[PDB]
Design an enzyme around this catalytic site. Structure first.
Site, PDB file in Angstrom:
ATOM      1  CG  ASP A   6      -0.318   0.049   2.533  1.00  0.00           C
ATOM      2  OD1 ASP A   6       0.898  -0.153   2.642  1.00  0.00           O
ATOM      3  OD2 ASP A   6      -1.030   0.316   3.520  1.00  0.00           O
TER       4      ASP A   6
HETATM    5  C1  LIG Z   1       4.608  13.743  16.722  1.00  0.00           C
HETATM    6  C2  LIG Z   1       3.403  12.946  16.226  1.00  0.00           C
HETATM    7  C3  LIG Z   1       2.477  13.866  15.441  1.00  0.00           C
HETATM    8  C4  LIG Z   1       1.235  13.106  14.997  1.00  0.00           C
HETATM    9  C5  LIG Z   1       1.172  13.073  13.474  1.00  0.00           C
HETATM   10  C6  LIG Z   1      -0.253  12.804  13.004  1.00  0.00           C
HETATM   11  C7  LIG Z   1      -0.703  11.401  13.373  1.00  0.00           C
HETATM   12  C8  LIG Z   1      -2.203  11.288  13.107  1.00  0.00           C
HETATM   13  C9  LIG Z   1      -2.470  10.112  12.182  1.00  0.00           C
HETATM   14  C10 LIG Z   1      -3.960   9.778  12.160  1.00  0.00           C
HETATM   15  C11 LIG Z   1      -4.669  10.725  11.198  1.00  0.00           C
HETATM   16  C12 LIG Z   1      -5.059  10.000   9.910  1.00  0.00           C
HETATM   17  O1  LIG Z   1      -5.035   8.821   9.863  1.00  0.00           O
HETATM   18  S1  LIG Z   1      -5.563  10.957   8.449  1.00  0.00           S
HETATM   19  C13 LIG Z   1      -6.930  10.118   7.594  1.00  0.00           C
HETATM   20  C14 LIG Z   1      -6.385   8.960   6.763  1.00  0.00           C
HETATM   21  N1  LIG Z   1      -7.453   8.066   6.344  1.00  0.00           N
HETATM   22  C15 LIG Z   1      -8.054   8.239   5.038  1.00  0.00           C
HETATM   23  O2  LIG Z   1      -7.675   9.099   4.324  1.00  0.00           O
HETATM   24  C16 LIG Z   1      -9.165   7.313   4.559  1.00  0.00           C
HETATM   25  C17 LIG Z   1      -8.517   6.278   3.656  1.00  0.00           C
HETATM   26  N2  LIG Z   1      -8.530   6.762   2.293  1.00  0.00           N
HETATM   27  C18 LIG Z   1      -7.535   6.481   1.258  1.00  0.00           C
HETATM   28  O3  LIG Z   1      -7.731   6.969   0.189  1.00  0.00           O
HETATM   29  C19 LIG Z   1      -6.275   5.602   1.409  1.00  0.00           C
HETATM   30  O4  LIG Z   1      -6.520   4.387   2.067  1.00  0.00           O
HETATM   31  C20 LIG Z   1      -5.055   6.323   2.017  1.00  0.00           C
HETATM   32  C21 LIG Z   1      -4.812   5.854   3.444  1.00  0.00           C
HETATM   33  C22 LIG Z   1      -5.214   7.839   2.022  1.00  0.00           C
HETATM   34  C23 LIG Z   1      -3.831   5.978   1.177  1.00  0.00           C
HETATM   35  O5  LIG Z   1      -3.587   4.609   1.271  1.00  0.00           O
HETATM   36  P1  LIG Z   1      -3.480   3.732  -0.117  1.00  0.00           P
HETATM   37  O6  LIG Z   1      -2.959   4.604  -1.228  1.00  0.00           O
HETATM   38  O7  LIG Z   1      -2.535   2.587   0.091  1.00  0.00           O
HETATM   39  O8  LIG Z   1      -4.835   3.184  -0.491  1.00  0.00           O
END
Ligand SMILES: CCCCCCCCCCCC(=O)SCCNC(=O)CCNC(=O)[C@H](O)C(C)(C)COP(=O)(O)O
Ligand SMILES: CCCCCCCCCCCCCCCCCC(=O)OC[C@H](COP(=O)([O-])OCC(O)COP(=O)([O-])OC[C@@H](COC(=O)CCCCCCCCCCCCCCCCC)OC(=O)CCCCCCCCCCCCCCCCC)OC(=O)CCCCCCCCCCCCCCCCC
Ligand SMILES: CCCCCCCCCCCCCCCCCC(=O)OC[C@H](COP(=O)([O-])OCC(O)COP(=O)([O-])OC[C@@H](COC(=O)CCCCCCCCCCCCCCCCC)OC(=O)CCCCCCCCCCCCCCCCC)OC(=O)CCCCCCCCCCCCCCCCC
Ligand SMILES: CCCCCCCCCCCCCCCCCC(=O)OC[C@H](COP(=O)([O-])OCC(O)COP(=O)([O-])OC[C@@H](COC(=O)CCCCCCCCCCCCCCCCC)OC(=O)CCCCCCCCCCCCCCCCC)OC(=O)CCCCCCCCCCCCCCCCC
Ligand SMILES: CCCCCCCCCCCCCCCCCC(=O)O[C@@H](COC(=O)CCCCCCCCCCCCCCC)COP(=O)(O)OC[C@H](O)CO
Ligand SMILES: CCCCCCCCCCCCCCCCCCCC(=O)O[C@H](COC(=O)CCCCCCCCCCCCCC)COP(=O)(O)OCCN
Ligand SMILES: CCCCCCCCCCCCCCCCCCCC(=O)O[C@H](COC(=O)CCCCCCCCCCCCCC)COP(=O)(O)OCCN
Ligand SMILES: CCCCCCCCCCCCCCCCCCCC(=O)O[C@H](COC(=O)CCCCCCCCCCCCCC)COP(=O)(O)OCCN
Ligand SMILES: CCCCCCCCCCCCCCCCCCCC(=O)O[C@H](COC(=O)CCCCCCCCCCCCCC)COP(=O)(O)OCCN
Ligand SMILES: CCCCCCCCCCCCCCCCCC(=O)OC[C@H](COP(=O)(O)O)OC(=O)CCCCCCCCCCCCCCCCC
Lengths: 125, 64, 55, 117, 546, 108, 157, 58, 88
Positions: free
Chosen positions: I44
């Site tokens: 991924d």
């Molecule tokens: C010092 C520490 C600071 C903290 C830093 C921030 C930490 C917070 C992390 C949590 C916030 C989130 O998850 S941010 C939100 C993230 N989740 C999404 O976007 C929904 C999924 N949609 C998609 O298009 C894909 O799965 C995608 C994953 C984008 C790409 O992976 P692939 O292309 O393989 O598919």
């Protein structure tokens, strides 16, 4: 290792700002402000308001103990008097305003020696 | 452009308008600078004032 | 100009250059009124300077 | 909050840059690499808990909160490899560019080497 | 032998920078530099034994009169007394080992003989500074080491940050140089001479001690002047060792010890605040050279407080200067060897193990670090404990707060020095370059400074070593417990969750950022006003069109 | 690959020669148009002066303000020097008739 | 650089049709970069058609009053009416032309011949009597066969 | 109305005209997250994500 | 040595193939030059972020972010590393 690669800085290809001499372009990439942190993002994304706000407490936190001991504590806190000297040796040693023998509260001229150790700035006429 | 894939390109530009500082900020910081870097002038003026007020006290209580 | 000069003369009790400067400022402000703005300052300065050069 | 460059990215590359910068900032705040490994695993598990989302509002809220966290925890002294920009060995002793030479310039057109008037 | 300690490093610099060096090359210039330092060190050893032990000062009229207009009389004259002999022994002995190190460290530099000539000039102007008998030849030495510091900090001139660090050092020191010049004017006006032996002051006009203190705070990098010292790490490692051990930063402390015309409140407050500030600054850095730079600033604070304490405190201040130079130069040389063994990396998160360095580099770092933290019966133990015990019995109430600040600083120093050893050697490996240096010249350079560390224990700096200032066992053995507390905390590698305090301290209280806009940007803007609004504007007279 | 000297010295101009002669203008800079424009504008910056609000305010508080500060400091230094020398009040320009120029035959 | 054309004078030639004050059309050839007053002088027009440019430091330039059509109004060079050159043009309009002025009135030294002037038709405008000194004047009548081109010098004194 | 010397003096009360042309900007390196921090105390310091990925792992 | 500041293609290929195989889901027999990270290997986006950071560690590079966005296959990584004068 002399002769390492380094990227060159581009020449201006647009009209220049009026006060352009606040950027230091030495020929290589990247240039810098004339003085660091004058503009651009500061390290750690802190700002001037951050430092002034933390300093408005921290400065009195450092100036607090000096004021307390300089105004609420005196020579008599010590368990002993300063180092003792014969009169011919002592009389020249305590002429210095710098000397730590003016804190001898058992001396017969303790007050007069303290009154002579007041710092002046303009020499009078 | 032969090293842009190694050290970065020229696409990101500097965010600064090269404009002068605000008038109040400049005035306040200049007044603070005058107070800090010219402190002997204020020390000597205070000496002259403290000296002349004592002579005022002497001339007041002497002729009574 | 003449009335302002003699009025400040008689008000201050003495003859000096202040009466001419005040009369020049008044006369030049009368000339410079209603004009864009270097002029309501520039014309009192010119008439006061004429008075100072006269003295 | 992200910069104007990161706000212009596509959503996939935006999330990828957020994960990459989080791993790098965890390097900067750690004492060693062996301290960094379980923090890297924990950050990876943190991103895996939002993978199966679909609501774009919840995605936007989580993304914006994480970008605020990364703007808060930007290290004041980042770890840069020395021979790159911001490193300690960048731009020290570069090879000279070719500079041109003029032989015997004083001997060319003698008696007429001043300024005109 | 007396003039050979001053002239002869200047001669080595003149040889290695002139067109004579076109005939010697790198190989011949290294020989010339090392020999020209060995001769000067031998001369300084003879001077030290004659003046310190047998008590016979020597005054030399070298080049006649410099300039003499009215009653302002400056002569080209030296005087070699106790302080001068102490300083000459220290400067030449440290600079010899730094030259022997630099002839191998900068071997792959393209302009090696130019670098060696700059090092020799810097050493020679320091010798001129301490050998002078009046204030104006001292000012020759002051500005000479300033100029050579500019040339050596910005040596790698193709790097912009190095150039800006050198310019910053010049400008920050120029403020204090102006105040020192005005103080010299005060001293000459109200005493009638410029020679040190005729400057005996009991009660002067306040501006004298204050302006000379500000001029000393510039060179010794005290509070609100320390900002240039950390950025001076842009220069190569021999430059940093010679700046932080024998030249430059010890000049202001030497000047205050020599003159003894200060007012003690300012001196004690400035010194103790500097010591605490540089202690907390060095506890939160990860650049290997910046931690050592901040420890230098902290020890200069200790010496400042000591010379505030009194004449005995002035002697203890000179003693701590003399013992500090040896282990500080040793620390910088060992750090340079560790950096070169790890591919040029200066971050302490990318070290570990005992493969990237020689056995002697690790031993040098260990022994100099133990002397710095006041481990018992090593070199720094005697001088640092003397200053601490003298501060515990001062009758000034201001010195009560200063002693507490010094004890907190001692715990912080034993924390971050132990952290420097722990990250470098004890933890698992986290770099990727293992090229350990085992050349003869840098190892002998480190061994000489370790021999001087042993010599300071065996033969003291002055008569204070072994004198007992009568303190209870609780007051006396507390700094040992503070050293142990720092060691235990740093080996436990514990951290706090108060991240805003961590980033306030690690960013070094924002002094540089606040200075970037409190004087600097206003100076630029006032220049804009004076040019555009004044010269082109209010004062400009136009043409008459016709 | 020009030849501007004979084997026994004797500079040759090469007026009709094909190869480009090295000369005084060989290292003249190639002008950047925007740099030339910016330097021209800064050379004629008196055409950009205007009596707006900021110009008037900064010309009052900094130029006139520091000029008045320096005049006050100069008068202060003059009076303090005359007091610390045993002189009475001395006549500066516009100060009524008083003492100017101490006499060397007099003890003050 | 290759087999491209050798430079000819015909590449830089500009042709202007000029109608004099008698209504006679004339074919006037010039070169690119040459002013119009110079081409009029070199064609062989009489000296009564020309007058000094009345600026400071430019009275050695001869100039003529021409009528320019509306299409070629924007190819006359720009003069700031607040500058000293503007006051020179104002002096010329005030003293030489007077009530012969039209909306097509220009001065021929302010027209620099280029390819955009190729085929432009202009006419010579009338002027009032004038004098610079005793050796250069105009009584008011265009009755003289002396060409301006045959004068060896233009004398300001 | 009345004709005076004030008509003949070139007063310096005309503002200089600027242009809408884009000015030159030097390139600088990228800072990915550059929001300016003004708060000494923030709830982001005690955020549960920070506790989960920095403080808590062993 | 060899090359005008650039590493040879074969050793770069070997090192990239070594770095790529450090996943649990990866079958080792599918790892080849010119193999796609997502379609062919089954990684991924987060796995690709970790792989590029590991290649930064392997060759001692500070890869700029826009360049790390473009790397999407084994052959892309090999071609990028062979164009670095700073790759060790
Ligand atoms: C010092 C520490 C600071 C903290 C830093 C921030 C930490 C917070 C992390 C949590 C916030 C989130 O998850 S941010 C939100 C993230 N989740 C999404 O976007 C929904 C999924 N949609 C998609 O298009 C894909 O799965 C995608 C994953 C984008 C790409 O992976 P692939 O292309 O393989 O598919
Ligand atoms: C130097 C390094 C600079 C940056 C680090 C900041 C350290 C500041 C601090 O207070 O850290 C304590 C810090 C505790 O913070 P924490 O562990 O994140 O918070 C406590 C726990 O949440 C929970 O802990 P707890 O509740 O079990 O109690 C621990 C804590 C009390 O914790 C509390 O509950 C806080 C309540 C406050 C009053 C008690 O105890 C104390 O701090 C009491 C004094 C000892 O100690 C450490 O674990 C770090 C040790 C490293 C050395 C610090 C030792 C003291 C040094 C003295 C000189 C100070 C120099 C700094 C100048 C300031 C500018
Ligand atoms: C009768 C004067 C003849 C001698 C000077 C001359 O030939 O000036 C021609 C020339 C005429 O130029 P313009 O193109 O008509 O422009 C007139 C000013 O630029 C007018 O420009 P402005 O709007 O800035 O003028 C207002 C003027 C305010 O005008 C005044 O201060 C007039 C008061 C003068 C009386 C003396 C007291 O303020 C200043 O320019 C700065 C303060 C002057 C001090 O005058 C100047 O270059 C300016 C004269 C200002 C005198 C002070 C010079 C400061 C040094
Ligand atoms: C000398 C060369 C020229 C001086 C520079 C003045 C200038 O051109 O400013 C333009 C500039 C016009 O700004 P703007 O962009 O058009 O917009 C601002 C207003 O909204 C536009 O308003 P405006 O100025 O066009 O006319 C309305 C104005 C109303 O002002 C007036 O109608 C005239 C202003 C004062 C009357 C003049 C009487 C005498 C002054 C001459 C002294 C001669 C000495 C004789 C001995 O009301 C205001 O703006 C409110 C502020 C007025 C304060 C007046 C205080 C002056 C007495 C001093 C007390 C101490 O003026 C300002 O920066 C605003 C302040 C107003 C005038 C300046 C007042 C103080 C400066 C005087 C310095 C001269 C003393 C030299 C010794
Ligand atoms: C009175 C003074 C007169 C001059 C004295 C100074 C000259 C001695 C130093 C000579 C130049 C140093 C550089 C040098 O010789 O480099 C070699 C280092 O030489 C040494 O062994 C060290 C130098 C001699 C010892 C140090 C002398 C300095 C004086 C201080 C002594 C203090 C004790 C390099 O190694 P190598 O040639 O031994 O090995 C070759 C290599 O492995 C194969 O390529
Ligand atoms: C009226 C008299 C006013 C006295 C003070 C005037 C100070 C003027 C400074 C002008 C600076 C112009 C040149 C300049 O920007 O150079 C920088 C020096 O910074 C600096 O000079 C920054 C430090 C400024 C501190 C000034 C006061 C110090 C003592 C406090 C009392 C470069 O250096 P850089 O800042 O980019 O360094 C980068 C390394 N990392
Ligand atoms: C771009 C900057 C470069 C910086 C250069 C280094 C820094 C220099 C700083 C100080 C410069 C001072 C130089 C002064 C030159 C001579 C001035 C004196 C002239 C003169 O006739 O004096 C006599 C000359 O003696 C003598 O000169 C001694 C006689 C010869 C024996 C020793 C020979 C000199 C060996 C020096 C080795 C290299 C040292 C490098 C400095 C001494 O007698 P007097 O009339 O003054 O009488 C009083 C005592 N008798
Ligand atoms: C476990 C943590 C305990 C921390 C204290 C350090 C160990 C001291 C043990 C103790 O109780 O000793 C007392 C020291 O207190 C005192 O009277 C001295 C207080 C200050 C000592 C701090 C430095 C300790 C040395 C490291 C009694 O002292 P004693 O009756 O045994 O003393 C005379 C013989 N020498
Ligand atoms: C020769 C070439 C250079 C000439 C420069 C311009 C000179 C202008 C002033 C000429 C003399 C004026 C008369 C002086 C005596 C007088 O009557 O005025 C005194 C003040 O004038 C003063 O002396 C104060 C005004 C003068 C300040 C300094 C000169 C300003 C012009 C140049 C500034 C350039 C700045 C660039 C932005 C009175 O004293 P008082 O009544 O105020 O005392 C308060 C207690 N009665
Ligand atoms: C150059 C700038 C250098 C200065 C840098 C910073 C220094 C800050 C000094 C602040 C204090 C200065 C001294 C004031 C307090 C002492 C006081 O001595 O007595 C004053 C002084 C001494 O009085 P006395 O000793 O009793 O005779 O008083 C005077 O006689 C002067 C009073 C009038 C002063 C202002 C006059 C108006 C001048 C306007 C100039 C503007 C022209 C603009 C043209 C464009």
């Amino acid at each position: 290792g002399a002769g390492a690669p380094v990227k060159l800085a581009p020449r201006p290809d647009k009209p220049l700002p009026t006060w352009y001499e606040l950027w230091w372009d030495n020929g290589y990439y990247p240039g810098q402000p004339a003085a660091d942190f004058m503009f651009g993002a500061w390290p750690g994304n802190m700002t001037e308001t951050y430092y002034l706000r933390f300093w408005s407490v921290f400065g009195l936190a450092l100036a607090a103990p000096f004021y307390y001991v300089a105004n609420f504590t005196d020579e008599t806190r010590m368990p002993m008097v300063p180092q003792q000297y014969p009169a011919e040796v002592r009389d020249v040693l305590v002429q210095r305003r710098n000397s730590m023998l003016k804190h001898d509260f058992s001396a017969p001229d303790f007050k007069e020696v303290k009154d002579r150790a007041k710092i002046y700035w303009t020499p009078m006429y | 452009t032969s090293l842009d894939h190694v050290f970065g390109d020229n696409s990101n530009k500097l965010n600064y308008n090269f404009e002068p500082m605000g008038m109040g900020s400049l005035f306040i910081r200049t007044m603070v600078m005058v107070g800090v870097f010219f402190f002997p002038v204020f020390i000597m003026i205070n000496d002259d004032y403290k000296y002349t007020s004592f002579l005022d006290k002497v001339a007041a209580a002497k002729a009574a | 100009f003449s009335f302002t000069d003699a009025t400040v003369e008689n008000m201050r009790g003495k003859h000096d250059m202040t009466s001419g400067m005040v009369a020049g400022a008044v006369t030049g402000f009368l000339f410079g009124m209603g004009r864009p703005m270097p002029q309501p300052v520039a014309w009192p300065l010119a008439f006061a300077g004429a008075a100072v050069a006269a003295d | 909050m992200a910069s104007e460059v990161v706000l212009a990215l596509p959503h996939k590359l935006r999330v990828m840059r957020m994960y990459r910068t989080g791993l790098k900032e965890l390097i900067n705040w750690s004492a060693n690499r062996h301290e960094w490994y379980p923090r890297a695993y924990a950050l990876r598990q943190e991103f895996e808990d939002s993978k199966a989302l679909t609501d774009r509002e919840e995605i936007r809220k989580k993304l914006e909160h994480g970008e605020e966290l990364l703007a808060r925890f930007r290290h004041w002294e980042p770890l840069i490899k020395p021979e790159f920009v911001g490193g300690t060995a960048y731009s020290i002793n570069p090879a000279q560019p070719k500079l041109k030479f003029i032989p015997n310039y004083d001997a060319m057109d003698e008696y007429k080497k001043g300024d005109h008037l | 032998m007396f003039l050979l300690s001053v002239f002869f490093p200047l001669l080595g610099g003149l040889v290695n920078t002139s067109p004579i060096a076109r005939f010697l090359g790198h190989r011949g210039s290294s020989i010339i530099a090392i020999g020209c330092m060995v001769v000067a060190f031998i001369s300084s050893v003879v001077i030290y034994y004659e003046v310190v032990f047998m008590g016979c000062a020597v005054s030399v009229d070298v080049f006649g009169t410099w300039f003499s207009v009215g009653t302002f009389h400056a002569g080209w004259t030296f005087n070699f007394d106790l302080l001068t002999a102490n300083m000459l022994f220290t400067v030449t002995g440290v600079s010899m080992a730094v030259h022997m190190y630099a002839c191998d460290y900068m071997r792959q530099d393209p302009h090696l003989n130019l670098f060696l000539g700059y090092l020799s000039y810097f050493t020679g102007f320091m010798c001129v500074l301490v050998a002078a008998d009046n204030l104006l030849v001292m000012l020759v030495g002051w500005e000479g080491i300033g100029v050579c510091s500019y040339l050596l900090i910005g040596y790698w001139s193709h790097r912009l940050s190095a150039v800006k660090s050198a310019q910053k050092a010049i400008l920050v020191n120029r403020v204090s140089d102006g105040l020192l010049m005005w103080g010299v004017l005060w001293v000459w006006y109200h005493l009638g001479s410029l020679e040190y032996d005729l400057l005996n002051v009991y009660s002067a006009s306040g501006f004298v001690g204050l302006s000379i203190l500000i001029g000393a705070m510039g060179k010794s990098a005290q509070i609100l002047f320390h900002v240039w010292l950390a950025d001076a790490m842009e220069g190569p490692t021999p430059v940093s060792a010679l700046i932080h051990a024998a030249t430059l930063v010890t000049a202001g402390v030497y000047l205050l010890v020599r003159l003894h015309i200060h007012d003690e409140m300012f001196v004690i407050i400035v010194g103790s605040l500097t010591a605490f500030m540089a202690g907390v600054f060095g506890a939160t850095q990860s650049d290997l050279k910046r931690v050592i730079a901040y420890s230098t600033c902290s020890q200069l604070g200790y010496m400042m407080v000591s010379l505030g304490l009194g004449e005995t405190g002035g002697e203890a201040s000179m003693g701590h200067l003399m013992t500090h130079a040896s282990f500080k130069a040793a620390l910088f040389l060992a750090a340079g060897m560790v950096i070169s063994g790890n591919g040029g990396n200066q971050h302490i998160a990318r070290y570990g193990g005992s493969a990237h360095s020689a056995m002697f580099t690790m031993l040098t770092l260990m022994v100099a670090s133990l002397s710095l933290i006041g481990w018992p019966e090593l070199s720094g133990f005697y001088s640092k404990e003397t200053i601490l015990n003298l501060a515990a019995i001062c009758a000034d109430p201001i010195a009560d707060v200063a002693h507490t600040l010094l004890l907190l600083t001692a715990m912080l120093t034993s924390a971050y020095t132990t952290k420097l050893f722990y990250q470098c050697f004890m933890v698992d490996f986290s770099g990727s370059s293992v090229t350990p240096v085992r050349n003869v010249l840098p190892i002998l350079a480190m061994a000489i400074l370790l021999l001087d560390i042993m010599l300071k224990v065996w033969v003291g700096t002055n008569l204070l070593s072994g004198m007992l200032f009568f303190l209870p066992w609780g007051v006396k053995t507390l700094p040992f417990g503070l050293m142990v507390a720092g060691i235990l905390t740093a080996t436990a590698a514990v951290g706090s969750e108060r991240f805003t305090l961590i980033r306030f301290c690690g960013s070094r209280w924002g002094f540089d950022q606040l200075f970037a806009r409190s004087p600097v940007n206003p100076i630029f803007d006032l220049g804009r006003i004076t040019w555009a609004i004044g010269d082109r504007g209010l004062l400009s007279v136009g043409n008459l069109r016709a | 690959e020009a030849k501007q000297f004979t084997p026994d010295g004797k500079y040759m101009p090469g007026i009709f020669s094909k190869a480009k002669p090295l000369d005084r203008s060989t290292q003249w800079v190639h002008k950047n148009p925007y740099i030339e424009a910016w330097y021209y504008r800064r050379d004629h910056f008196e055409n950009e002066f205007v009596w707006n609000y900021r110009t008037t305010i900064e010309a009052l508080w900094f130029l006139g303000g520091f000029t008045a500060a320096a005049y006050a400091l100069s008068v202060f230094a003059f009076r303090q020097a005359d007091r610390r020398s045993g002189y009475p009040k001395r006549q500066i320009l516009g100060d009524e008739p008083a003492m100017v120029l101490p006499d060397e035959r007099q003890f003050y | 650089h290759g087999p491209a054309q050798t430079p000819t004078v015909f590449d830089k030639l500009v042709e202007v049709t000029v109608v004099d004050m008698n209504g006679i059309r004339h074919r006037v050839r010039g070169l690119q970069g040459q002013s119009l007053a110079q081409a009029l002088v070199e064609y062989g027009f009489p000296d009564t058609y020309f007058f000094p440019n009345m600026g400071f430091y430019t009275q050695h330039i001869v100039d003529a009053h021409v009528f320019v059509p509306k299409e070629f109004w924007g190819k006359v060079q720009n003069v700031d009416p607040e500058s000293d050159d503007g006051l020179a043009v104002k002096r010329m309009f005030r003293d030489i032309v007077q009530d012969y002025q039209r909306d097509t009135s220009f001065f021929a030294s302010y027209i620099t011949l280029g390819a955009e002037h190729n085929g432009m038709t202009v006419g010579i405008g009338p002027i009032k009597p004038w004098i610079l000194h005793s050796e250069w004047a105009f009584a008011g009548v265009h009755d003289s066969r002396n060409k301006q081109f045959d004068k060896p010098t233009v004398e300001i004194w | 109305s009345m004709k005076t010397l004030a008509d003949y003096i070139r007063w310096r009360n005309k503002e200089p005209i600027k242009a809408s042309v884009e000015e030159w900007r030097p390139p600088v390196p990228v800072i990915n997250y550059d929001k300016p921090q003004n708060d000494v105390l923030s709830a982001l310091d005690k955020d549960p994500i920070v506790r989960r990925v920095l403080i808590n792992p062993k | 040595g060899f090359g005008g500041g650039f590493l040879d293609k074969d050793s770069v290929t070997e090192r990239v193939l070594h770095v790529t195989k450090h996943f649990e889901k990866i079958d080792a027999s599918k790892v080849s030059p010119a193999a796609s990270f997502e379609k062919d290997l089954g990684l991924d986006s987060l796995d690709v972020v970790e792989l590029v950071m590991a290649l930064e560690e392997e060759f001692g590079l500070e890869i700029p972010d826009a360049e790390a966005d473009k790397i999407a296959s084994v052959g892309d990584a090999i071609n990028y590393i062979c164009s670095n004068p700073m790759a060790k």
